[PDB]
């Protein structure tokens with residue numbers, strides 16, 4: 001900590017606190033995540049160093065990893081705003097479609113890259129997507145397969161957002177696939193368009209049921225194997241799928257077609273990041289400059 005001047009706290013998670021800080025030596029401004037433990041997991045710490053090699057324009061750069069004094073510090077390149085704040089600042093007007101499209105395209109490139117390197121994000125949400133004045137957007141705060149005991153109560157405690165969680169996770173799947181990130185990104189795409197969260201559940205069952213109420217209760221026809229999943233109950237209510245044109249108006253058919261493919265129930269039917277990049281929706285993609293108030 002003596003090597004870093006804390007300028008201000010820029011957030012807090014269940015097991016980590018994030019500060020904007022300055023390197024007393026270099027003068028470089030960074031985001032510093034501080035994580036508290038009785039020796040700390042080497043396995044979890046392992047995966048970390050791995051992320052250091054994942055360098056891509058749409059992935060926040062992990063500069064350094066420091067284990068010391070029973071604390072783990074992650075130092076990342078600093079960006080000035082997250083998508084959650086940007087969406088809130090743009091709620092009255094809405095983000096222009098060309099910017100929505102550019103951000104979606106860039107995030108898919110980022111995912112295409114991590115997925116081809118067998119890296120999953122696992123917890124995409126607007127707060128973990130960072131933007132800069134040049135029109136770029138980047139994936140931040142990648143989640144580990146396991147880096148700390150199943151989070152359920154933080155020091156001061158904070159409510160975990162389930163809004164972007166894929167249905168297979170909610171149904172108890174033990175192994176996540178790259179498809180979980182595509183689902184989360186589709187939820188974010190919908191939110192940028194409508195200016196309302198797609199599935200705002202306040203509990204795991206409410207989250208699951210909100211997804212079911214919109215996309216219809218899944219069955220073996222659309223999702224083979226779903227009725228044998230760990231948390232599936234034959235007692236789940238059976239909702240009919242809602243007309244998709246009601247879900248994200250006034251998004252055009254190209255956008256709606258791509259979103260429907262990102263939200264397929266079956267992880268194996270859900271579009272890949274690579275395939276999504278080739279979807280007709282991106283035929284006219286460009287890279288606009290966002291109006292950012294910092």
Ligand SMILES: Nc1nc(Nc2ccc(S(N)(=O)=O)cc2)sc1C(=O)c1ccccc1[N+](=O)[O-]
Pocket residue numbers: 010011018019031032033060074076077078079080081082083085086127128130140141
């Ligand atoms: N790199 C980086 N930059 C940031 N700046 C920032 C500046 C302003 C705002 S805001 N609310 O719009 O004013 C938000 C973020 S956060 C961040 C992260 O890498 C990060 C992102 C999410 C969770 C945890 C971490 N983390 O582990 O450091």
